[PDB]
Every structure is written in C-alpha cells, then in structure tokens.
Short mmCIF file of N, CA and C and ligand atoms in Angstrom, two decimals:
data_model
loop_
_atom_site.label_atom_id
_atom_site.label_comp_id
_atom_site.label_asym_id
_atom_site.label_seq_id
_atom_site.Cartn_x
_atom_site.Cartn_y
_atom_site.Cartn_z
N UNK X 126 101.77 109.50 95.46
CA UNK X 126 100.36 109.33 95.15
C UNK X 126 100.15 108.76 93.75
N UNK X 127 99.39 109.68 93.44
CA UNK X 127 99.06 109.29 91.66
C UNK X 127 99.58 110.35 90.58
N UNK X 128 100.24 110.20 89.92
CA UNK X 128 101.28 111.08 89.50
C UNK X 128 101.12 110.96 87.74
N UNK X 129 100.33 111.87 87.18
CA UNK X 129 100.03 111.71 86.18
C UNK X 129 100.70 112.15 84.65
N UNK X 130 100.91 111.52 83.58
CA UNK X 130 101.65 112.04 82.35
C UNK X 130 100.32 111.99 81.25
N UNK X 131 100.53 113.50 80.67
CA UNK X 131 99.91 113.55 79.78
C UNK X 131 100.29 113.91 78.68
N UNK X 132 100.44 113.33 77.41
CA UNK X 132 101.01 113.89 76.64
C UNK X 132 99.69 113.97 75.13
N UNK X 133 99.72 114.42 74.24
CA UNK X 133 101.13 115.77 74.06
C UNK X 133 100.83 116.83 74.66
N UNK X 134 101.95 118.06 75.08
CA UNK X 134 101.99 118.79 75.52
C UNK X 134 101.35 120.49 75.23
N UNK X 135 101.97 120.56 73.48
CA UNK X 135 101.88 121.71 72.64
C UNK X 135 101.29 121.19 71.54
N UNK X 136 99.84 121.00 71.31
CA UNK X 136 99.35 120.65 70.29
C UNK X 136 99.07 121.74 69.24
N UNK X 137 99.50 121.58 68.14
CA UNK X 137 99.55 122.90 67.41
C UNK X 137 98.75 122.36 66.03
N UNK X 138 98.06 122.04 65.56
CA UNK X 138 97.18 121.17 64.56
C UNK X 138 96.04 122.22 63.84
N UNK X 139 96.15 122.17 62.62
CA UNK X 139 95.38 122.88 61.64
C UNK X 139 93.79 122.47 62.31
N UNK X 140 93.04 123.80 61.88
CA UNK X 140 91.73 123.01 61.91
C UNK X 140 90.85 122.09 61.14
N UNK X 141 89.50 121.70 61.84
CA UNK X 141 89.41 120.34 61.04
C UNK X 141 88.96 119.48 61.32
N UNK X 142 90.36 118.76 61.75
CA UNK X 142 91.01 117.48 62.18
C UNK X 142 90.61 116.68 62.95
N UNK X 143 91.42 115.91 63.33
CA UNK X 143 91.11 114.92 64.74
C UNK X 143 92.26 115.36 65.00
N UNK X 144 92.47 115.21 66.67
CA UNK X 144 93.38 115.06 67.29
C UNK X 144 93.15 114.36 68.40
N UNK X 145 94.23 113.88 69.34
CA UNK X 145 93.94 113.17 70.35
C UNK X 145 94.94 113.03 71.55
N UNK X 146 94.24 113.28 72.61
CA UNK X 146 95.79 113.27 74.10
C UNK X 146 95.40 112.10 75.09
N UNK X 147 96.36 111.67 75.05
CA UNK X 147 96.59 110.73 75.87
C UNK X 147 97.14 110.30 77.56
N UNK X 148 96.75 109.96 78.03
CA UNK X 148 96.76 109.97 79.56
C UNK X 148 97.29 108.86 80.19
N UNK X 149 98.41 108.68 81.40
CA UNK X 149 99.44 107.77 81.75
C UNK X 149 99.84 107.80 82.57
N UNK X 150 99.08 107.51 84.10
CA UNK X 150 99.35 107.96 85.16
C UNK X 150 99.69 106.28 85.89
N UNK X 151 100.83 106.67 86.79
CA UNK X 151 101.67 105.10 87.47
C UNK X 151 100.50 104.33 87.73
N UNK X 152 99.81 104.48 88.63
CA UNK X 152 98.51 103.99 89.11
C UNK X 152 97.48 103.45 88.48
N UNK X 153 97.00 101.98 88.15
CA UNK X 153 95.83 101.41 87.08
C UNK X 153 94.36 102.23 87.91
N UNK X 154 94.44 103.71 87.64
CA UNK X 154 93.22 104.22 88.54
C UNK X 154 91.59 103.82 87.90
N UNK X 155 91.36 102.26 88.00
CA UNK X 155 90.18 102.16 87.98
C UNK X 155 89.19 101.09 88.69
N UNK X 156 88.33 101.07 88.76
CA UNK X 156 87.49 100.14 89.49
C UNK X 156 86.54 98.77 89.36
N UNK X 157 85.96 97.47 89.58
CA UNK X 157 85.48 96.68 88.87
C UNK X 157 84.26 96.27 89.29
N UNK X 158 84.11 97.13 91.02
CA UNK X 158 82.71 96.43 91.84
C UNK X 158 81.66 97.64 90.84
N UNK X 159 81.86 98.61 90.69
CA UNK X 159 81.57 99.45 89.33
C UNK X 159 82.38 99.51 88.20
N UNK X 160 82.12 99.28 86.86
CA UNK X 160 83.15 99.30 85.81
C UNK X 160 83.37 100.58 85.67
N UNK X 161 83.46 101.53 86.25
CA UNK X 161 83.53 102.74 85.92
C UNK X 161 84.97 103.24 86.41
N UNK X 162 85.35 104.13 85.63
CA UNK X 162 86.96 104.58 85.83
C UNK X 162 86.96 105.86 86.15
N UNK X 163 87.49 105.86 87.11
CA UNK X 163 87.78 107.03 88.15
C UNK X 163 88.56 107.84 87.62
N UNK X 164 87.90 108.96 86.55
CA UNK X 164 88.72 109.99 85.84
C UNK X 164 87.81 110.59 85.02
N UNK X 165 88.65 112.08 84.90
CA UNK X 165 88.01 112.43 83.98
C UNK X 165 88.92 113.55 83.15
N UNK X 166 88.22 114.23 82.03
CA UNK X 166 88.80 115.09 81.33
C UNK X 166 88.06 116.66 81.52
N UNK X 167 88.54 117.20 81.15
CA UNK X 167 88.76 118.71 81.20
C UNK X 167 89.14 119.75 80.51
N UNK X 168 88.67 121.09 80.13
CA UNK X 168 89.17 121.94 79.24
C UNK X 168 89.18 123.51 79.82
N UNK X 169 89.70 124.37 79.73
CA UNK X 169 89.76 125.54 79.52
C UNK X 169 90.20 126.42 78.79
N UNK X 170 89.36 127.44 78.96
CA UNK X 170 89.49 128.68 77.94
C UNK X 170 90.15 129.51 78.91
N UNK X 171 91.03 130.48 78.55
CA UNK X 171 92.26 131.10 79.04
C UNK X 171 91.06 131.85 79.55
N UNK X 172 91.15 133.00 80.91
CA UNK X 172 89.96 134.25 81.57
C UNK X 172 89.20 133.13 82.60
N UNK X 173 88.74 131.85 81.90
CA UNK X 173 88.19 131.77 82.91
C UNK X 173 88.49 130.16 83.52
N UNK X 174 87.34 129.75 84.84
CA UNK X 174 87.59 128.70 85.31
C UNK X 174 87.19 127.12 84.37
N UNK X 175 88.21 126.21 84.55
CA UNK X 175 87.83 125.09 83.45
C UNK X 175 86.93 124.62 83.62
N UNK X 176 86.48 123.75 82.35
CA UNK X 176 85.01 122.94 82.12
C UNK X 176 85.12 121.50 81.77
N UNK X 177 84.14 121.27 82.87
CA UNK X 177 84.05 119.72 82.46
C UNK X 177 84.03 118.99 81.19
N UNK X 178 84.50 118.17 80.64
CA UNK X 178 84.44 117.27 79.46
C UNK X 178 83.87 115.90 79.70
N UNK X 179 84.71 115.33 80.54
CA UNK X 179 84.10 113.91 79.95
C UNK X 179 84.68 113.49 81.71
N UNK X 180 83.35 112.53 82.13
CA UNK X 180 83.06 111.92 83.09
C UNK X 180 83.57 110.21 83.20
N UNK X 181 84.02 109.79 84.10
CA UNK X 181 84.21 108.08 83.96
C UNK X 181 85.13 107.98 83.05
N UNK X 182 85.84 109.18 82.36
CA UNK X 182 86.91 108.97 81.13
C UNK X 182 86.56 108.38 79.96
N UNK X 183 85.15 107.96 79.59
CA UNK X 183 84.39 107.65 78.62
C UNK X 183 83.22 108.05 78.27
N UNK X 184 82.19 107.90 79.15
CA UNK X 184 80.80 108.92 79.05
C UNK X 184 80.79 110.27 78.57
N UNK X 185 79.76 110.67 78.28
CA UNK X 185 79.85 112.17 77.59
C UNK X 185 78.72 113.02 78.36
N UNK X 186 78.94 114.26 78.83
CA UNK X 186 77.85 114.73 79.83
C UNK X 186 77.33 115.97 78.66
N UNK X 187 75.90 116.40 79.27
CA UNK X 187 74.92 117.45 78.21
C UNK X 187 76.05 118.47 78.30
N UNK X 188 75.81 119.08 77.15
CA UNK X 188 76.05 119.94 76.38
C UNK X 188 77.44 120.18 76.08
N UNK X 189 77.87 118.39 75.77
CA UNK X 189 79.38 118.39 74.63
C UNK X 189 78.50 117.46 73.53
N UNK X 190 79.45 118.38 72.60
CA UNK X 190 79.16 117.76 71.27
C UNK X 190 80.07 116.39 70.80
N UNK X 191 80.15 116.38 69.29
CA UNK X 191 81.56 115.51 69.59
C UNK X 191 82.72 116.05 69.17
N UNK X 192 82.47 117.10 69.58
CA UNK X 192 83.71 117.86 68.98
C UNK X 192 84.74 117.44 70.57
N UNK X 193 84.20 116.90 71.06
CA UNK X 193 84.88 115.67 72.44
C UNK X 193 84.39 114.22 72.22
N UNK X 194 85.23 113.65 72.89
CA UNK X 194 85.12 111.83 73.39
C UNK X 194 85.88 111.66 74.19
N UNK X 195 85.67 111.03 75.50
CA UNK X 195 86.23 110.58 76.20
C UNK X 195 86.54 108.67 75.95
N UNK X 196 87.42 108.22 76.43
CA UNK X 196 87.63 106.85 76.22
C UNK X 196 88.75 106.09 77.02
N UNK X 197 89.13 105.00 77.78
CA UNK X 197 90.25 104.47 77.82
C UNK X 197 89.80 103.79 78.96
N UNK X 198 90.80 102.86 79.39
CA UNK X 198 90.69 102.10 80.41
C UNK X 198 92.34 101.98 81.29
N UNK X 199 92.54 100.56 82.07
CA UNK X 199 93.73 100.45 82.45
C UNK X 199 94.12 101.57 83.27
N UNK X 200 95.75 102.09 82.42
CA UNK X 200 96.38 103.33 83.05
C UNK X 200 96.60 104.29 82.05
N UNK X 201 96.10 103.80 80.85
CA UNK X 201 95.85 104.67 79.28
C UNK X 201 94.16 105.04 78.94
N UNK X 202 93.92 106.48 79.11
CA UNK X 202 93.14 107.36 78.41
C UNK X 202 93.63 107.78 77.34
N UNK X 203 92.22 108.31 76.76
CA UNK X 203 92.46 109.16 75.05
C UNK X 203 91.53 110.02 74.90
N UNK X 204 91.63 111.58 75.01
CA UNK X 204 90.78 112.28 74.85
C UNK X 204 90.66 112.37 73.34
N UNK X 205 89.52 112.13 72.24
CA UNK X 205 89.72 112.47 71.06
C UNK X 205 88.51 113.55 70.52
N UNK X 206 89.24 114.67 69.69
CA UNK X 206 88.48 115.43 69.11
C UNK X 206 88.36 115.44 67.86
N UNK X 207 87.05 115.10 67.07
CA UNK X 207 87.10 115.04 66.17
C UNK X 207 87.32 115.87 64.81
N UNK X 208 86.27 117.26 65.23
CA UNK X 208 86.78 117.85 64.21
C UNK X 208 87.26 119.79 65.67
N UNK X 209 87.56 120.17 64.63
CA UNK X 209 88.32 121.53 65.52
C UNK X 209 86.92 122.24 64.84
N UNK X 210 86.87 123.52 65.68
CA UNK X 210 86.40 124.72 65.69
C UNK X 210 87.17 126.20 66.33
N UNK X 211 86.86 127.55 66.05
CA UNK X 211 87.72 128.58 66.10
C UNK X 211 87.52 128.52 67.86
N UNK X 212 86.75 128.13 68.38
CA UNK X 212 86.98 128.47 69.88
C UNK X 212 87.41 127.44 70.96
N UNK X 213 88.15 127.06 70.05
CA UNK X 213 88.87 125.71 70.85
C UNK X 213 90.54 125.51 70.84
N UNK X 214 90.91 127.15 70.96
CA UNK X 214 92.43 127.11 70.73
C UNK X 214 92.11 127.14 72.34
N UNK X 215 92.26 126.19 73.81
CA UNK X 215 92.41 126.06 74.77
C UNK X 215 93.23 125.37 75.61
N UNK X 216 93.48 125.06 76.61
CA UNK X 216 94.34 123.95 77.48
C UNK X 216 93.47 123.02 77.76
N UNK X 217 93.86 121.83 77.99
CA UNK X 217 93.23 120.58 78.47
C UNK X 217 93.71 120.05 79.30
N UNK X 218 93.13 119.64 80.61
CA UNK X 218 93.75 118.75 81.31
C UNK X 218 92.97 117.08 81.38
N UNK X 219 93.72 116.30 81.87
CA UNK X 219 92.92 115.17 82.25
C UNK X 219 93.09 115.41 84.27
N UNK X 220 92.28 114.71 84.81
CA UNK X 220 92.33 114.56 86.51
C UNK X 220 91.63 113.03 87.13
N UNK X 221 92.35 112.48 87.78
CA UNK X 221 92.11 111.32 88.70
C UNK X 221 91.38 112.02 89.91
N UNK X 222 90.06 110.77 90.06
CA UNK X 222 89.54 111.16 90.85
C UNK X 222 89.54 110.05 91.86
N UNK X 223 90.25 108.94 91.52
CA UNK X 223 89.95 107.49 92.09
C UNK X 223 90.58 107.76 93.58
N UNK X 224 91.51 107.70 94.32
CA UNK X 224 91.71 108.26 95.44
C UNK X 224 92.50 109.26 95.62
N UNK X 225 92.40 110.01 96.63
CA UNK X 225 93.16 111.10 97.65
C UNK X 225 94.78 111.19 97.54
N UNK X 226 95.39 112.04 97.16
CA UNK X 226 95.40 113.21 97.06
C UNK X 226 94.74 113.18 95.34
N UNK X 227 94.10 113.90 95.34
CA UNK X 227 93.62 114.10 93.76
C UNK X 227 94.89 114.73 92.97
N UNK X 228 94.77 114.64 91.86
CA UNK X 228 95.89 115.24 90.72
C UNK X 228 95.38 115.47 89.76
N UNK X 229 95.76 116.32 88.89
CA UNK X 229 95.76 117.23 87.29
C UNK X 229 96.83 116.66 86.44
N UNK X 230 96.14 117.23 85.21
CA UNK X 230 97.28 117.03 83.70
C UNK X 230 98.28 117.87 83.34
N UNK X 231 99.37 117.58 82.89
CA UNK X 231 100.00 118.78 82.73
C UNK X 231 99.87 120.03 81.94
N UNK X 232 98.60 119.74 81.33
CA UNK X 232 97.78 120.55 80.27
C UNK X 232 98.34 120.08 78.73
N UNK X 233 97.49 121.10 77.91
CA UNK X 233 97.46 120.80 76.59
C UNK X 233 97.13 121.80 75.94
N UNK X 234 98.06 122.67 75.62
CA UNK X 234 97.28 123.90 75.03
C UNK X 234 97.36 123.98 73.07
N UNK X 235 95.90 123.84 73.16
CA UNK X 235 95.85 123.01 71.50
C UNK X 235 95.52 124.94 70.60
N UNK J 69 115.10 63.34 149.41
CA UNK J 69 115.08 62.06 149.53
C UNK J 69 113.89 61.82 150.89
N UNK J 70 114.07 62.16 151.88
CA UNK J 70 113.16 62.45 153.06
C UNK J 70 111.57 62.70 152.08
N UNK J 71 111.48 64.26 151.52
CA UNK J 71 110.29 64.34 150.68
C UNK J 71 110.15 63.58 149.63
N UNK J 72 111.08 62.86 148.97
CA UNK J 72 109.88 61.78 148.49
C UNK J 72 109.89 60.62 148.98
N UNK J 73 110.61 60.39 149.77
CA UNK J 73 110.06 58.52 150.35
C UNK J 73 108.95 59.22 151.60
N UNK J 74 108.57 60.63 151.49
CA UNK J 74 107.69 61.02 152.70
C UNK J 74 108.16 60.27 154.38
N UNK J 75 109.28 60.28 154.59
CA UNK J 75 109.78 59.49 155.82
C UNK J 75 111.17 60.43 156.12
N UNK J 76 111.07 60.40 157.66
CA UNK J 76 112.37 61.10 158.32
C UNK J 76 113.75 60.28 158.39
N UNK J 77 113.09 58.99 158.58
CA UNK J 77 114.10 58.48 158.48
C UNK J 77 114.41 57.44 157.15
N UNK J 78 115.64 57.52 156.46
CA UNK J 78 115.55 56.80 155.03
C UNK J 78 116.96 55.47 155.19
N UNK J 79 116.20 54.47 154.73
CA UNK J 79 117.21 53.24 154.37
C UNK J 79 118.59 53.07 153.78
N UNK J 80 119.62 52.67 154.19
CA UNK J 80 120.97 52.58 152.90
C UNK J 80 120.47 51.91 151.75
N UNK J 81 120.86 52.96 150.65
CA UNK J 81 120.22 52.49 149.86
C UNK J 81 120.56 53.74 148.18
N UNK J 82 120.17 53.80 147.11
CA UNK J 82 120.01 54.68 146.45
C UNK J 82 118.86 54.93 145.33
N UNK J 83 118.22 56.40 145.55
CA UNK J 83 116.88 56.82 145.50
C UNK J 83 117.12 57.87 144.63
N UNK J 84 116.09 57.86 143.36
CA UNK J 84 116.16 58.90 142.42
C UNK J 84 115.13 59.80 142.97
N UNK J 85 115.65 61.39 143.13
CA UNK J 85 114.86 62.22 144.18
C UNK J 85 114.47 63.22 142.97
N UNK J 86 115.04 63.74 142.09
CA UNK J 86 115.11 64.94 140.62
C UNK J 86 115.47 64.72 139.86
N UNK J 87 115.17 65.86 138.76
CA UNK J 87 115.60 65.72 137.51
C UNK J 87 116.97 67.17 137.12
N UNK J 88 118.37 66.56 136.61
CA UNK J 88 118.85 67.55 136.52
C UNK J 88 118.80 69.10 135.04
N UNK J 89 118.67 69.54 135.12
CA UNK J 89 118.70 70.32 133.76
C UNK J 89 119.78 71.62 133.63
N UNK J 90 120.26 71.78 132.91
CA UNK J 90 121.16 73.07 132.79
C UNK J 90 120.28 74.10 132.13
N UNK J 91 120.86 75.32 132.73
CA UNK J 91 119.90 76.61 132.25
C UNK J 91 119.93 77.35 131.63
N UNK J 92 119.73 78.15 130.34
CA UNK J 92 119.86 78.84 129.56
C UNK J 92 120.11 80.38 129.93
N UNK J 93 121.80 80.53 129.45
CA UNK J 93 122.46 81.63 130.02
C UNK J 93 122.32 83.11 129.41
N UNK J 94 121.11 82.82 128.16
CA UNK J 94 120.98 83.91 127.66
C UNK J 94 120.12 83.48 126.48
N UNK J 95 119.85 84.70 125.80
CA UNK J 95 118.61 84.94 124.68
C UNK J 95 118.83 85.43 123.51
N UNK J 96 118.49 85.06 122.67
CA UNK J 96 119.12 85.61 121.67
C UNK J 96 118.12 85.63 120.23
N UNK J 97 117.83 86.68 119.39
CA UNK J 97 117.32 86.66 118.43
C UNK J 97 117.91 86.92 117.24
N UNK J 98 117.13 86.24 116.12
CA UNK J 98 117.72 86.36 114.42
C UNK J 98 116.12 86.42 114.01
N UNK J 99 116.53 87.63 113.18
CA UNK J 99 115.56 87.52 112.57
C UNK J 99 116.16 89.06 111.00
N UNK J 100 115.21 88.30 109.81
CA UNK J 100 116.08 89.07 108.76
C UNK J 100 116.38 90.67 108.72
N UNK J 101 117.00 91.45 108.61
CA UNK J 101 117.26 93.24 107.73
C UNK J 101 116.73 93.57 107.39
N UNK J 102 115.37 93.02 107.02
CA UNK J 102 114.47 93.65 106.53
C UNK J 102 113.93 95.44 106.47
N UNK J 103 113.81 96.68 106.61
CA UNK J 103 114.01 97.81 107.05
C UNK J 103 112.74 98.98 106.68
N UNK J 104 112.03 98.46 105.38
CA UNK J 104 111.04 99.29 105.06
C UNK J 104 109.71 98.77 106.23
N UNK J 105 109.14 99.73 106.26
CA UNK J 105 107.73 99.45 107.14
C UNK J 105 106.72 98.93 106.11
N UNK J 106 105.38 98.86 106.48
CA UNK J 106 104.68 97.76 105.67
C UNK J 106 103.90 98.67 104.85
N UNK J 107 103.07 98.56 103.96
CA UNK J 107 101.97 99.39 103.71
C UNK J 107 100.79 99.22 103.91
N UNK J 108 100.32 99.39 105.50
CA UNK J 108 99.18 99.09 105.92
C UNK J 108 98.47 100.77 105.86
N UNK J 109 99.18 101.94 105.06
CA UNK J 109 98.41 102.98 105.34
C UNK J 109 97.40 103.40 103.96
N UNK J 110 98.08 102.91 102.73
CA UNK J 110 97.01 102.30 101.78
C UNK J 110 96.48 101.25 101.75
N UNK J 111 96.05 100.54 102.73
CA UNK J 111 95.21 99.29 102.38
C UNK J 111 93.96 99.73 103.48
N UNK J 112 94.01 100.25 105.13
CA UNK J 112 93.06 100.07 105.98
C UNK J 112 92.39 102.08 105.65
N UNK J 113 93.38 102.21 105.06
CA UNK J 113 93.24 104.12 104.96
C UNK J 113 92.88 104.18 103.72
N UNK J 114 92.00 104.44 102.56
CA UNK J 114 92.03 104.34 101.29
C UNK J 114 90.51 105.00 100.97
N UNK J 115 90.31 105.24 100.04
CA UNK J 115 89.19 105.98 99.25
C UNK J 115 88.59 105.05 98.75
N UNK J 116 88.76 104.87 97.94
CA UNK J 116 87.58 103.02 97.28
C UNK J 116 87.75 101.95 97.92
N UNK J 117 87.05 101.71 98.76
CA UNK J 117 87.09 100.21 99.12
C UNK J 117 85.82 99.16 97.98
C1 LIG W 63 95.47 106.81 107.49
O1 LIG W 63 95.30 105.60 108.37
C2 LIG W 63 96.24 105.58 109.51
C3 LIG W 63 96.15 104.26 110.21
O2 LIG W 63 96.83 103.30 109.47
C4 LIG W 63 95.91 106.73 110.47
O3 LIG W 63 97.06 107.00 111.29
C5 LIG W 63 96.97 108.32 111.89
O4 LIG W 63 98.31 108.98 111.99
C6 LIG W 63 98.21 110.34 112.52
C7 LIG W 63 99.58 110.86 112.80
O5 LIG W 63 100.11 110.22 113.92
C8 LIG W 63 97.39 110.38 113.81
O6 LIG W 63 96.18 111.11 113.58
C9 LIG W 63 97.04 109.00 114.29
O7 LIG W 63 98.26 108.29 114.62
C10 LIG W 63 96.30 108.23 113.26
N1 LIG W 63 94.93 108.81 113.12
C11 LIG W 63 93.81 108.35 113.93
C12 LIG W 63 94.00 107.23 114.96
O8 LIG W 63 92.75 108.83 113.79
C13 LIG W 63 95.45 107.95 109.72
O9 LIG W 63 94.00 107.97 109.74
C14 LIG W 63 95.90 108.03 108.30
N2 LIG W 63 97.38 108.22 108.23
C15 LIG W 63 97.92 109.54 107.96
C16 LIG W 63 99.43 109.76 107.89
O10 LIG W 63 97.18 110.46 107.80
#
C-alpha cells in the first residue's frame, strides 16, 4: 500500500523552540484535479484518543494555534512547531488519507 | 476434370482441374516469459479517480 516514514522518532527538545517532523511515505500521495494533498497530521496526549492537527497537510483547522503548521507537498511533509508549551510533551503522528488501505506515523513522542 | 469442363465425357487432352497446397502439421506459439500479472487492480479499483 502506502507505507509511511516519519521521522524523527524521539524528539527530546528544550522548550521554546521550533521543532519540526517530517513525513516520507513511497507513494507521491497527492492530487491535482484538487490541489489539495491527501494527508494529514495528528497529535496525542497519552489517556486519551488523538487530535486532529492539520488538514490537506497544510491548512490549519479552529482551535490550533501556531503552536502547529502543517505544510508540504510531493512525498515530503513538515509538521512545524513553533514555539513549545508545558502540555505538549505528546506523540504525533502524520496519516494518508489519499487511498485505501489508510496508514499512520510511526509517532513522535516530543 | 468431368466437374469442371461440366461434361461426362472429356477430350485427350490436358486440363488444370485444382490447386495443390500442403498442410500445416501443427501449431505452435512464441511468445515472451514474461510472468508478473498486470496492475489493472490499482488503476479500475482505486479511491481517487
Ligand atoms: C478491486 O477490483 C477488482 C477488479 O479488478 C475486483 O476483483 C474482485 O476480486 C474478488 C476476489 O475474487 C471477487 O469479489 C471478485 O473476483 C471481484 N469483485 C467483484 C466482481 O465485485 C475487486 O472489486 C477488487 N479486488 C480485490 C482483491 O478486492
């Protein structure tokens, strides 16, 4: 199918910062009769079920700040965060939504 | 010779009556090793068209 690499894996980064993960799946999963790219990003907090981030792998949906960005095209995404806050020691995934069988990130626990 | 001069009785003489052909004693195909099947199950089967 679509078989996705996400790296980095163990992000361990002072707060602050920027940081940023990157996404690399075999498949150019995107589209041109819509420019829109069939992906998106993702986060969770350990207890419970994950939360949406970022739509089309670039757009930003209500109620993210920018303490997210979504961005990328091709077969390269970049989730970037700009600055950290205390409730964002979480996992991240990225997920293809472009066709069947769907797939996940290998996470990111920042 | 009778069916084509259409007559029972035929002249001394010599009359082209057929055509001869030799017959093909067998069949035979080539074609390449080729071995993988095609991928017609992502192209007619697929999510975004
Ligand atoms: C995707 O499309 C193919 C046609 O290229 C369909 O083939 C099916 O294969 C399964 C298993 O034999 C059977 O249901 C039928 O042979 C086909 N389904 C039909 C006629 O509805 C199928 O829709 C998809 N292929 C697979 C493996 O799921």
């Amino acid at each position: 199918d679509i078989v996705m690499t996400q790296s980095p894996d163990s992000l361990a980064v002072s707060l602050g910062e920027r940081a940023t993960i990157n996404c690399k799946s075999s498949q150019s999963v995107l589209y041109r009769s819509n420019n829109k790219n069939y992906l998106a990003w993702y986060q969770q907090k350990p207890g419970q079920p994950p939360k949406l981030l970022i739509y089309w792998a670039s757009t930003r949906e209500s109620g993210v700040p920018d303490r997210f960005s979504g961005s990328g095209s091709g077969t390269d995404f970049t989730l970037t965060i700009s600055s950290l806050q205390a409730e964002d020691v979480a996992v991240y995934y990225c997920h293809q939504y472009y066709s069947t069988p769907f797939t996940f990130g290998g996470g990111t626990k920042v | 010779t009778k069916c084509t001069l259409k007559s029972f009785t035929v002249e001394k003489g010599i009359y082209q009556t057929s055509n001869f052909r030799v017959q093909p004693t067998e069949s035979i195909v080539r074609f390449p090793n080729i071995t993988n099947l095609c991928p017609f199950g992502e192209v007619f089967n697929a999510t975004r068209f």
